[PDB]
Write a protein that binds this ligand. Structure first.
Ligand SMILES: *[C@@H]1O[C@H](CO)[C@@H](O)[C@H](O)[C@H]1NC(C)=O
Ligand SMILES: *[C@@H]1O[C@H](CO)[C@@H](O)[C@H](O)[C@H]1NC(C)=O
Ligand SMILES: *[C@@H]1O[C@H](CO)[C@@H](O)[C@H](O)[C@H]1NC(C)=O
Ligand SMILES: *[C@@H]1O[C@H](CO)[C@@H](O)[C@H](O)[C@H]1NC(C)=O
Ligand SMILES: *[C@@H]1O[C@H](CO)[C@@H](O)[C@H](O)[C@H]1NC(C)=O
Ligand SMILES: *[C@@H]1O[C@H](CO)[C@@H](O)[C@H](O)[C@H]1NC(C)=O
Ligand SMILES: *[C@@H]1O[C@H](CO)[C@@H](O)[C@H](O)[C@H]1NC(C)=O
Lengths: 165, 48, 233
């Protein structure tokens, strides 16, 4: 039948264009996927990074390794990921785990006093009252005296702590 | 915290390990290639 | 004719960069000092089975070998795959095409019926030794390729991944496409009618083996050891 689009006919006889989309999922070597990249980039600080998967946490910095054209990410011994190629600009970025380490409490004993000094093992306190750096870590709450005494509380690397009194 | 770790209200002279320090991430980044391979969805939908 | 294979046939297993690391990988590799089939293309292309893995080698200069065809039954009743290396670009097609028993695709008499499903194009692959490796462990056709200028030398060479087609068809029978210079454009003969150049292609069937690969400082493989070749290895 002829539509005959005059202003005489009503709304039920108007030319509405229509499209329907169907999807197949069986036997899936996935070749289609809708969601776009939706990317964001930032460096020089700890971030949850996702490089075509490869979900991890760490700080991304400029690397110097020479990747091959087809390589996307690298690993060190024991299968730890060291570098990843930025899929957008193809730049090789070096991944370094975030700064962490155990903290120990130097205490003269509640019998004597409530004073305490904390030792961040292996941490360089340039990245987190007296602050003192030693080979065993950074020591906060204890002052470095230049007079040598017997070891009361062993910290490490030839340094010890004790209650002055 | 030393008391809480030793499970006692009194602590003797010494050095005690109590917890772990780790810098928490600041923000999340997601990276993907230059995804620009678009299908003729528009070219089919707007066809005459 | 059969010929022994040197340390050739190794490839980058998993696209990961490693510097000064000895990686032991258990995957489909070509056994060292193994006999591979050696056929000439200037005389006589029978249908050859496609096992779990196929290592294709070609020592040619005048690009006599121009492509490959694959499929489950090599008939229209099943899916099939075709690869052609034209001078302008490579053409890859998955069309369940019905190939003839001798596809002299210089003519274009390679197939009669065609109705396609999936395609792909890129730069073309190509006295010169060309090593190809075809892998179908998963629902994807992996093509590793490498080209060297020089018989198979005793030197070392690691094939790099070139193409990864996400297609899940069966690869069980394969044939190579010939492009003789000036011969009749009909299937009445096979690799004859013209003095085709000295073209030799080798077929090697990969096997599941454990290889110890040595990575240099720049992330390229320099040596490999087959753990099942010798007691010393
Ligand atoms: C992605 O696009 C940006 C800007 O258009 C460009 O700088 C970059 O090189 C592109 N990367 C790729 C892999 O095409
Ligand atoms: C507290 O008791 C401990 C345990 O014997 C002892 O080492 C320390 O000197 C005592 N301190 C005082 C102030 O009595
Ligand atoms: C801590 O960092 C500073 C600044 O980079 C450096 O001079 C110092 O040697 C470092 N110390 C340790 C123990 O890492
Ligand atoms: C120990 O000597 C250093 C170096 O002169 C000085 O900084 C520090 O204040 C001295 N410690 C004391 C307790 O005077
Ligand atoms: C693929 O299908 C063909 C057709 O029956 C069969 O001969 C072949 O064994 C199959 N291969 C695999 C790996 O399933
Ligand atoms: C192509 O033709 C074959 C039979 O010749 C048929 O099985 C197949 O469904 C058709 N379509 C495609 C996309 O292969
Ligand atoms: C890695 O490549 C650079 C640049 O070509 C070269 O100078 C260096 O010698 C190479 N490394 C080795 C171990 O040969």
């Amino acid at each position: 039948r002829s539509y005959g689009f005059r202003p005489t006919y009503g709304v039920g006889h108007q030319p509405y264009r229509v499209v329907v989309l169907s999807f197949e999922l069986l036997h899936a070597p996935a070749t289609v996927c809708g969601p776009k990249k939706s990317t964001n980039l930032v460096k020089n600080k700890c971030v949850n990074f996702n490089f075509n998967g490869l979900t991890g946490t760490g700080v991304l910095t400029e690397s110097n390794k020479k990747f091959l054209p087809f390589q996307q990410f690298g690993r060190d011994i024991a299968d730890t990921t060291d570098a990843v190629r930025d899929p957008q600009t193809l730049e090789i970025l070096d991944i370094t785990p975030c700064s962490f380490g155990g903290v120990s409490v130097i205490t003269p004993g509640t019998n004597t006093s409530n004073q305490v000094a904390v030792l961040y093992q292996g941490v360089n306190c340039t990245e987190v009252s007296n602050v003192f750096q030693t080979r065993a870590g950074c020591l906060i709450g204890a002052e470095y005296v230049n007079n040598s005494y017997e070891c009361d509380i062993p910290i490490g690397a030839g340094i010890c702590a004790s209650y002055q009194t | 915290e030393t008391k809480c770790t030793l499970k006692s209200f009194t602590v003797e002279k010494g050095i005690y390990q109590t917890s772990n320090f780790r810098v928490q991430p600041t923000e999340s980044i997601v990276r993907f290639p230059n995804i620009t391979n678009l299908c003729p969805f528009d070219e089919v939908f707007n066809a005459t | 004719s059969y010929t022994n294979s040197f340390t050739r046939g190794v490839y980058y297993p998993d696209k990961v960069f490693r510097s000064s690391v000895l990686h032991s990988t258990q995957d489909l590799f070509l056994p060292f000092f193994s006999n591979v089939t050696w056929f000439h293309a200037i005389h006589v292309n029978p249908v050859l089975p496609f096992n779990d893995g196929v290592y294709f080698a070609s020592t040619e200069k005048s690009n006599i070998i121009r492509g490959w065809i694959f499929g489950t039954t090599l008939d229209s009743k099943t899916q099939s795959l075709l690869i052609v290396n034209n001078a302008t670009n490579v053409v890859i097609k998955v069309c369940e095409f019905q190939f003839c028993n001798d596809p002299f695709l210089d003519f274009r008499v390679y197939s009669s019926a065609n109705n396609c499903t999936f395609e792909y194009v890129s730069q073309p692959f190509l006295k010169n030794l060309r090593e190809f490796v075809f892998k179908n462990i998963d629902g994807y056709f992996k093509i590793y390729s490498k080209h060297t200028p020089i018989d198979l030398p005793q030197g070392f060479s690691a094939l790099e991944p070139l193409v990864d087609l996400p297609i899940g068809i069966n690869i069980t029978r394969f044939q190579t496409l010939l492009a003789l210079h000036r011969s009749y454009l009909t299937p009445g003969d096979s690799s004859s009618g013209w003095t085709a150049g000295a073209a030799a292609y080798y077929v090697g069937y990969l096997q599941p083996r454990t290889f110890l690969l040595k990575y240099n400082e720049n992330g390229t493989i320099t040596d490999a050891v087959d753990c099942a070749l010798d007691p010393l290895s």
